Design a protein around this ligand. Structure first.
Ligand code: K
Ligand code: K
Ligand code: MG
Ligand code: MG
Ligand code: MG
Ligand code: MG
Ligand code: MG
Ligand code: MG
Ligand code: MG
Ligand code: MG
Ligand code: MG
Ligand code: MG
Ligand code: MG
Length: 235
RNA sequence: CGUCGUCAGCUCGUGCCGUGAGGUGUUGGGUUAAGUCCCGCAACGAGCGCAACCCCCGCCGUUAGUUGCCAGCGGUUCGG
């Protein structure tokens, strides 16, 4: 909530190509063939976006975090592992929202296998199943790591790159789900309901935005939490 | 009942794409006897198939000696 001047490394967009003309309103200028985001409109939209986040958080709503860009996976896997908003980390499975019932059946199988590895029934039905179900539970935890928390459809989604995660955006639009996204120059701003015009490639931009967002979430429900242990993920 | 053919296939549920017949999944890369499995993927699962569970032959044991052996000894018309 105090990220006015601390925006170090967010204004750097993508190159001259691979952009989207609809983003021109959020662009300041072009330095050395690289689009640079307008600093003013960034906080201009941040006001409205963080205000919507605070409103939805103090109401007890759930926000799905979607990150697959390989530069925000390790960040989302813990910023959502904070206050219980679920997340999608490895890859976004087609139908996680429009076919939510079938994915919830997969989650039922996940907790079923977790219960079988808690009961003494691990030894019966010998080692063949003890390896098959082991690998099955392994991949179910790999893909449904954060998704297992969604009991019903979420009240909003948070995307790190709406171009890389366009399928999730489309599925949210189909179900009238508000779409919060950290957009860059390579994305269509019209599809995003609450835009955050920043950088999606750098690690510091994602860490800053998501840390401040989860901090605002916990602040909307009281009990301000310590600074997130995501700085060590700079490496 | 024969046959394609023990061939590796044929479909469904939900989602998604297309005005629609339909497509996706079942395509792809690796792999196997196999739609076998792995990885990837707007798909996620499932059914009938594949394989497995059944029978026979291969090694060993337990249980039991009207089948078997001077394995072990005695008798022997010396033929367990
Ligand atoms: K068309
Ligand atoms: K193949
Ligand atoms: Mg065959
Ligand atoms: Mg179908
Ligand atoms: Mg057509
Ligand atoms: Mg249609
Ligand atoms: Mg079909
Ligand atoms: Mg087909
Ligand atoms: Mg095809
Ligand atoms: Mg199969
Ligand atoms: Mg596939
Ligand atoms: Mg007899
Ligand atoms: Mg006998």
């Amino acid at each position: 909530t105090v990220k006015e001047l601390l925006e170090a490394g967010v204004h750097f967009g993508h190159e001259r190509k691979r952009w989207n003309p609809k983003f021109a309103r959020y662009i300041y200028a072009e330095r050395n063939g690289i689009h640079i985001i307008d600093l003013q409109k960034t906080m201009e939209e941040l006001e409205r976006t963080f205000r919507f986040i605070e409103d939805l958080a103090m109401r007890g709503g759930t926000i799905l975090f979607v990150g697959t860009k390989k530069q925000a996976q390790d960040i989302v896997r813990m910023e959502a592992e904070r206050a219980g908003m679920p997340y999608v980390n490895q890859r976004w499975l087609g139908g996680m929202l429009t076919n939510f019932k079938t994915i919830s059946q997969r989650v039922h199988r996940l907790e079923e296998l977790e219960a079988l590895f808690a009961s003494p029934e691990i030894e019966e039905r010998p080692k063949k199943e003890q390896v098959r179900l082991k690998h099955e539970l392994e991949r179910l935890q790999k893909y449904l790591s954060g998704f297992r928390l969604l009991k019903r459809l979420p009240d909003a989604i948070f995307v790190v790159d709406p171009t890389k995660e366009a399928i999730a955006v489309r599925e949210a639009r189909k179900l009238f789900i508000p779409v919060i996204a950290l957009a860059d120059t390579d994305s269509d701003p019209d599809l995003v309901d609450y835009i955050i015009p920043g950088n999606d490639d750098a690690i510091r931009s994602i860490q800053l935005i998501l840390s401040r967002a989860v901090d605002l979430i916990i602040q909307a429900r009281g009990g301000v939490v310590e600074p997130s242990p995501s700085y060590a993920l700079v490496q």
